[PDB]
Write a protein that binds this ligand. Sequence first.
Ligand SMILES: [K+]
Ligand SMILES: [K+]
Lengths: 238, 120, 31, 246, 100, 157, 49
Amino acid sequence: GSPWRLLGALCLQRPPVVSKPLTPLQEEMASLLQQIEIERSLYSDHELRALDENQRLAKKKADLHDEEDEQDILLAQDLEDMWEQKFLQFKLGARITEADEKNDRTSLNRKLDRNLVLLVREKFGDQDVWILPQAEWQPGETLRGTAERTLATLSENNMEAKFLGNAPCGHYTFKFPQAMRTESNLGAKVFFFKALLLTGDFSQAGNKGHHVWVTKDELGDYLKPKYLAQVRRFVSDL
Amino acid sequence: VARKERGWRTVFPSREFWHRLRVIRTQHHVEALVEHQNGKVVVSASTREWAIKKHLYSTRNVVACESIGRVLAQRCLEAGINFMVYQPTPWEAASDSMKRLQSAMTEGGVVLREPQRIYE
Amino acid sequence: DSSRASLTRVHRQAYARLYPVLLVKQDGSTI
Amino acid sequence: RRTPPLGPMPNSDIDLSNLERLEKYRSFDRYRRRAEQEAQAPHWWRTYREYFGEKTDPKEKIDIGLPPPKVSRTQQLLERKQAIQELRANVEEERAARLRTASVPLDAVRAEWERTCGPYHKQRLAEYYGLYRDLFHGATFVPRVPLHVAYAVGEDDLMPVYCGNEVTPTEAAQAPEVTYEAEEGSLWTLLLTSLDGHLLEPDAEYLHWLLTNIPGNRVAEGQVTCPYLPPFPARGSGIHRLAFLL
Amino acid sequence: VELTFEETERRALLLKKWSLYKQQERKMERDTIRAMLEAQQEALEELQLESPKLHAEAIKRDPNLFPFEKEGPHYTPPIPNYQPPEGRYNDITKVYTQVE
Amino acid sequence: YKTKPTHGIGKYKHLIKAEEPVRAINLGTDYEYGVLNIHLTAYDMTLAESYAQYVHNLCNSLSIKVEESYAMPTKTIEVLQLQDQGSKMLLDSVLTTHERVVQISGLSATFAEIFLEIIQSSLPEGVRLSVKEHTEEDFKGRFKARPELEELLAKLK
Amino acid sequence: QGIKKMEGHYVHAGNIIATQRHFRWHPGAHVGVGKNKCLYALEEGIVRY
RNA sequence: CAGAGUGUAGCUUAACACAAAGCACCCAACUUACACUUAGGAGAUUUCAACUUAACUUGACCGCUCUGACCA
Ligand SMILES: [K+]
Ligand SMILES: [K+]
């Protein structure tokens, strides 16, 4: 064996659920792009019918010719009015959920626009520390296979994660604080593997408050300073 | 009556000239050179010069290229250079920058064609 | 971000006017 | 029979194993730029430059001129950047550049050019004209004192002398008006020579004008060592060069 | 309809801002890839020193990675109890056949 | 000249890839993936085209070879809706589905994780990403169906 | 077809320097090229390759 | 927190002064797209003091990179 204890951590990430709000400049560009597109486009079928309908209505007033006008039962603006009514009746889902107002950092539903990372609290040496879920490597297993195992060990979890590749995306090497330093057990070496949370969540008993789903900005409050520096390298916030 | 360097018909650009206007455009600057066929630079105008840069909002736009033409034309007349050839590529010749730079030179007095050699 | 490549216009010479609409899916999500 | 190359052959450093992954020119202008650079480098094979290039001496040209002026680069650069910021901040400047209606003031450009890059441009042009080769046998100097020679033509006009601009013998009938910037108590010597005028001897010149021990810039008060003679280029002999050396 | 001078001026200035805004998106995205790549490579080097066999497995390709399917984000999230209208989907795509 | 040291100074065809007048799919090695098809399907043609353009440019920045960029045939679907207090389905909307493919090759085994993460984060709303391994069936699916060959082939069956 | 005037040979204006079916030798300074790719001297002087 | 190395925007053994350069890079138009071309956009000497010279040399001051302490 070797002095360093091989560990395998899992960086399980919930990708953004909804699109991100446009910034002020993006909104200005979006308006200009919409304006340019309208200017350079041809008349749509709806526009032509509205033009034709108005023209025929003037013809009916100025002249007595009718030409059946069966389609004139409904005008193109009358249709627009009906379309708007149905839209105002439908209520859209809330992009800002109750967990955003309650600040429940245990639920997936919060912060739909941003990416979230899983953090589980583990007790080492009679001390509580926040870390990414990890397991200890065992012979007859690939290093990624150890990360695949971390999910199974989680308390009452029903989640299907998609693992990206076999190589680790980071590493954190620490040494015990002189309490149990020994040549046999010098320290540990965690290797992180990224995954995507396809579907699922923790159960009520698993929602005991020993885990949080946190964005990269609010990731420092939990993770220790040295641990935070190595996790903030492969966790993007694009 | 001086010999021009004829030949080089299969390569570009020609050598059959006494003086040529050569324009160098970079990512940040615009430089125009008048050089003899032997390779000696006679006069030059660059936006790198403080004398020109201090009056330019941008040193890389069409205005800078037109300004360089005007400055170079004056320096050409003071050096005695009244004729030169300009050898642009097809895309360079079509560009608005080079068209404005050429107009500046012709308006400034310089003729961008050279008189034919007298052989007899 | 989703806005990286979402700000666009119809890059055609001849095209009829198009209108922005919300497509409500079967689960209630919109696009 | 083969002979090994006498040096590194062209296109040798290119790795031909990874040809598909190597970056290509993709543009005519990028190849031409590299091609022009390659043409200028020295080569161990026969080249056009070898047979047609002027044979410059390997030893550098001796400088016989005034010492370069001392400038504080840090302060100069700071002031220059501040000026550009002010010019770019103006909204009217940006619109004129965007609408391509802006122009530079040529008079101001020449004044600044004369203070800064003027001397080096005059040296470059003087070298091209052969003045250093003929006057000083190849020794060069930077004309760090701008000299303004103008031939009075009529009563209301002047014919300025620059650096190779044509002036007719009729315009140069009388001595020119010479003005330069000089401090008090300094002394100067002004001469006028015709490099090409000499009739009998090819390498000799004609001393048209010599003024010596000029106090400051008061050319009129200098000693007339040689009186002024108007240029007399012979008919059919070509275009001559006349140089004023301060 | 011809645009007013102020409109054409406003559109030109907005696009000038767009060049710089998009330049800074690319930088943020170009510095993120670099950070990820450095972290991965540094971890792999650390994993070769500790255990070469595991490093050999780590650098192999994953047969199960592809097909990799990901839908883009929605505008609004799914509604917990939303009943869609009843209807049918009738494909009307033209079928093109090559004869001769 | 052959005898002279400058022999071969004008050689240039070793610096250019040989040109040969459908295409064999290169299966990836243990450490590099094979030809990969990046499908981009959206109900809006501009979003699919814009993201396909983003993916092509991103691959160029990363020195990932783009074998081909092409569009798949558009699929039109009529959307009928049961009318209120009626048993008749009436046409509601016609939705078209636009697909764009960016075919890449030579992606590394390690770098695949980083590449996939970047191209999913920038995915616009309503655009589906599907990265598949290229197969002959994918290429053949871009060609018109031949009914005459089917009838002649049926006789052999 | 081939070189008529080798390195160092004196040529007069008009003298055909070389004849070639393809561009084996390219025209340089004071060397014209004919319709059939024929290289001829444009000046009196010394041939140089 | 200590000990070393280290210093122009992304790179460069660009920077004599006449000057902070060349390329890479970003937007738009063209292109299915890419590429090319055109027309635009954004940039740096870590900060002071020493022939005032000095992006360059010596010092501090900052940022950076490793080596230890700290570390679950
Ligand atoms: K003479
Ligand atoms: K021939």
